[PDB]
Write an enzyme that holds these catalytic residues in place. Structure first.
Site, PDB file in Angstrom:
ATOM      1  N   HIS A 341       0.778  -1.240   0.000  1.00  0.00           N
ATOM      2  CA  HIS A 341       0.000   0.000   0.000  1.00  0.00           C
ATOM      3  C   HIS A 341       0.816   1.300   0.000  1.00  0.00           C
ATOM      4  O   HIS A 341       0.250   2.379  -0.269  1.00  0.00           O
ATOM      5  CB  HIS A 341      -0.988  -0.005   1.178  1.00  0.00           C
ATOM      6  CG  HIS A 341      -2.311   0.636   0.867  1.00  0.00           C
ATOM      7  ND1 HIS A 341      -2.425   1.788   0.117  1.00  0.00           N
ATOM      8  CD2 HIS A 341      -3.576   0.261   1.173  1.00  0.00           C
ATOM      9  CE1 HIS A 341      -3.703   2.113  -0.001  1.00  0.00           C
ATOM     10  NE2 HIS A 341      -4.421   1.210   0.642  1.00  0.00           N
ATOM     11  N   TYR A 455     -14.339   5.437   9.413  1.00  0.00           N
ATOM     12  CA  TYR A 455     -13.480   5.972   8.359  1.00  0.00           C
ATOM     13  C   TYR A 455     -13.990   5.490   7.012  1.00  0.00           C
ATOM     14  O   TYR A 455     -14.284   4.295   6.832  1.00  0.00           O
ATOM     15  CB  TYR A 455     -12.048   5.485   8.619  1.00  0.00           C
ATOM     16  CG  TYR A 455     -10.947   5.890   7.667  1.00  0.00           C
ATOM     17  CD1 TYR A 455      -9.830   6.572   8.132  1.00  0.00           C
ATOM     18  CD2 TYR A 455     -10.982   5.524   6.317  1.00  0.00           C
ATOM     19  CE1 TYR A 455      -8.787   6.928   7.275  1.00  0.00           C
ATOM     20  CE2 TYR A 455      -9.934   5.860   5.455  1.00  0.00           C
ATOM     21  CZ  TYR A 455      -8.846   6.549   5.940  1.00  0.00           C
ATOM     22  OH  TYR A 455      -7.818   6.876   5.121  1.00  0.00           O
ATOM     23  N   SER A 457     -12.620   5.983   2.985  1.00  0.00           N
ATOM     24  CA  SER A 457     -11.621   6.555   2.057  1.00  0.00           C
ATOM     25  C   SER A 457     -12.286   7.382   0.977  1.00  0.00           C
ATOM     26  O   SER A 457     -13.374   7.015   0.478  1.00  0.00           O
ATOM     27  CB  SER A 457     -10.787   5.452   1.349  1.00  0.00           C
ATOM     28  OG  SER A 457     -10.192   4.569   2.294  1.00  0.00           O
ATOM     29  N   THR A 468      -5.483  10.303  -0.531  1.00  0.00           N
ATOM     30  CA  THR A 468      -6.815  10.234   0.069  1.00  0.00           C
ATOM     31  C   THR A 468      -7.086  11.271   1.168  1.00  0.00           C
ATOM     32  O   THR A 468      -6.166  11.841   1.773  1.00  0.00           O
ATOM     33  CB  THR A 468      -7.078   8.835   0.689  1.00  0.00           C
ATOM     34  OG1 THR A 468      -6.176   8.629   1.778  1.00  0.00           O
ATOM     35  CG2 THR A 468      -6.931   7.704  -0.377  1.00  0.00           C
TER      36      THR A 468
END
Ligand SMILES: CCCCCCCCCCCCCCCC(=O)N[C@H](CC(=O)[O-])C[N+](C)(C)C
Ligand SMILES: CCCCCCCCO[C@@H]1O[C@H](CO)[C@@H](O)[C@H](O)[C@H]1O
EC number: 2.3.1.21
Length: 627
Positions: A341, A455, A457, A468
């Protein structure tokens, strides 16, 4: 030719003129912060947090913000958050497996027999390499969001914009309501890996490398997929080399080296240095520099749960977790992209994923009846050999023990809500995305009787180096509406419930529009804290507030992608007592694939999500809710 697209507008034509990521006004950031704390904090907690925000805004926060703005104006080539955000991934010492690395899985080829493992591994590999060549030629169409593709995504516009210099190109798109995105990450799609180091890992690329890395049964194989002239190797030779690997009869190694990439980053950093000491650098460089890692698993998928575990982590032996991505193809042709990531984001991986699905299914390189080339794969394919010391073998056994222990704690499951999706909800003048998010709030209330840090994104790739921003779905409106449905459904009329949902949707729509424009509060508060720390100052009191910690301990971590190439996707929770919620709202249905550790129950959560979606759709159809 070896290209999957033939753009007349250079891939990178808009890069130079992309707008800079906005830094919100500090007064806006504090207001938004408090708005998101309102559903999470008791009255006394909120009052304490409110007082801290007041002092921050007029005190040390004001000063850090002035410095942040000054710094941003000395660095107009990037964003204020790009450095801090690369740091968040690369300084992280925990395993990249589960904590960070997601997956997206491909739908099958619509033609049954093209899902043969050898056939599909060849076709997916060739398409991926075609993507590489297309990017390098500047023939890949620039990534552009169009408010109306009918007007701006046309050859007519493309014809003109190709003459506008890159210093001005972005404005030509903007003027037609089209929004070019950052594509700087594409430079790490291929020939790239993450190297463990003390303090902070390193992003390595070697664009000169022409070879593929293949993992089968923990054995490492490499062969050229680009010739010495830059052309794609004959797909029949690729097919032959893949068949050669599939045919190999060696059992899994005593000490599968791939386990090491799942370790804590300090542990792996040390063990990699030891591999180098022991003469493995040339071998390591072949692994590090390969175009990508292709993983050939020797079993079919039992069901979607099996698929999720397989693509999210596998058994520890047959993924090089450090690679920019691993392209996994199972025995039944089920395929996925699992990616590291630190270098990349959903939007960029999805573009690759989408172009590879299109090209491999509409213009496959080989058929299920193709005959592999009569090629000397014994010479052309190198089976890598690592020189392992006693310390490395102990390290691999400990890597496996840690891996197996963690994977045991992980559950994943999915639902497919068939009653409706985008079509129904749009007709009710609601945001489909808001409705899924409301369902998660409502489900968590039903299961645990709490409102928790949430949360979602959101891409800021409309801006230079944008990645993001966090949408905060848990709002005053979702809390109110979840309370109404769950705790006192007899107390509200169907019209009142509908109004509550309209309000949820409006507010979510507002948060979404703001986050996409860099007007969330999370990245900005993040950068201010990072700046204090980087300048050698004590953490401001705002950041010591347990409410700040709670806000950033995301029990509900969510993300969605929309694509006809995607069968499902997933990620583990970001905290021990969390859910990792991957979802999509389709025209006719809504899917969720939810992960959990031991401290939460994904099966019960999904039963709650289903019930909540039933209640929501009932109320929207004017039906009194089933209790
Ligand atoms: C059965 C139906 C299931 C369909 C699932 C739809 C597929 C969604 C896949 C999403 C996987 C993650 C893709 C992009 C990575 C991403 O969103 N990273 C997020 C990055 C960020 O900065 O927020 C991190 N996190 C996942 C923890 C929120
Ligand atoms: C054919 C495509 C039309 C290009 C129109 C170019 C408009 C760019 O004009 C821009 O205006 C901004 C605001 O004044 C400034 O920030 C930039 O410095 C300036 O270059």
């Amino acid at each position: 030719d070896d290209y999957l697209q033939h753009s007349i507008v250079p891939t990178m034509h808009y890069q130079d003129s992309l707008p800079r990521l906005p830094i919100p006004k500090l007064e806006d950031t504090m207001k938004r912060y408090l708005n998101a704390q309102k559903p999470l904090l008791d009255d006394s907690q909120f009052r304490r947090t409110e007082a801290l925000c007041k002092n921050f805004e007029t005190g040390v926060g004001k000063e850090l913000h002035a410095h942040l703005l000054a710094q941003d104006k000395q660095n107009k080539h990037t964003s204020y958050i790009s450095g801090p955000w690369f740091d968040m991934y690369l300084t992280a010492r925990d395993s990249i497996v589960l904590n960070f690395n997601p997956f997206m899985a491909f739908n099958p080829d619509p033609k049954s027999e093209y899902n043969d493992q050898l056939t599909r591994a060849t076709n997916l590999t060739v398409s991926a390499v075609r993507f590489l060549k297309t990017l390098q030629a500047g023939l890949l169409e620039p990534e552009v969001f169009h408010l109306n593709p009918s007007k701006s995504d046309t050859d007519a516009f493309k014809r003109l914009i190709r003459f506008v210099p890159p210093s001005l190109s972005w404005y030509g798109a903007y003027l037609v309501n089209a929004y070019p995105l950052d594509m700087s990450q594409y430079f790490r799609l291929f020939n790239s890996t993450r190297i463990p180091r003390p303090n902070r890992d390193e992003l390595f690329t070697d664009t000169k490398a022409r070879h593929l890395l293949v993992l089968r049964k923990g054995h490492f194989y490499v062969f050229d997929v680009l010739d010495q002239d830059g052309n794609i190797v004959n797909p029949l030779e690729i097919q032959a080399h893949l068949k050669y690997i599939l045919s190999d009869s060696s059992p899994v190694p005593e000490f599968p080296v791939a386990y090491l990439t799942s370790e804590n980053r300090d542990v792996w950093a040390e063990l990699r240095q030891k591999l180098i000491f022991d003469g493995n650098e040339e071998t390591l460089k072949k692994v590090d520099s390969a175009v990508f890692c292709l993983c050939l698993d020797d079993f079919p998928m039992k069901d979607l749960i099996h698929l999720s575990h397989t693509m999210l982590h596998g058994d520890g032996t047959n993924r090089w977790f450090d690679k920019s991505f691993n392209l996994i193809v199972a025995e039944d042709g089920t395929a996925a992209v699992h990616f590291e990531h630190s270098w990349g984001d959903g939007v960029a991986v999805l573009r690759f994923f989408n172009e590879v699905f299109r090209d491999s299914t509409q213009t496959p390189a080989i058929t299920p009846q193709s005959q592999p080339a009569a090629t000397n794969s014994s010479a052309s394919v190198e089976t890598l050999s690592f020189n392992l010391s006693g310390a490395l073998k102990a390290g691999i056994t400990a890597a496996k023990e840690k891996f197996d222990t963690t994977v045991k704690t992980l559950s994943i499951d999915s639902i497919q809500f068939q009653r409706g999706g985008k079509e129904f909800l749009k007709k009710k003048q609601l945001s489909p995305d808001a409705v899924a998010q409301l369902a998660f709030q409502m489900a968590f209330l039903r299961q645990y009787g709490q409102t928790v840090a949430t949360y979602e994104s959101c891409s800021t790739a409309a801006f230079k180096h944008g990645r993001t921003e966090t949408i905060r779905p848990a709002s005053i409106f979702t809390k109110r509406c979840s309370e109404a449905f769950v705790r006192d459904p007899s107390k509200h009329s169907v019209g009142e419930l509908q109004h509550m949902m309209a309000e949820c949707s409006k507010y979510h729509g507002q948060l979404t529009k703001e986050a996409a424009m860099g007007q969330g509060f999370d990245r900005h508060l993040y950068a201010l804290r990072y700046l204090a720390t980087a300048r050698g100052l004590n953490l401001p009191e705002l950041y010591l507030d347990p409410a700040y910690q709670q806000m950033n301990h995301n029990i509900l971590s969510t993300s969605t992608l929309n694509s006809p190439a995607v069968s499902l996707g997933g990620f583990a929770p970001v905290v021990p007592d969390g859910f990792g919620i991957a979802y999509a709202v389709h025209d006719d249905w809504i899917g969720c694939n939810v992960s959990s550790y031991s401290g939460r129950n994904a099966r019960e959560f999904l039963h709650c999500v289903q019930k909540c979606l039933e209640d929501i759709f009932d109320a929207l159809e004017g039906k009194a809710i089933k209790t």
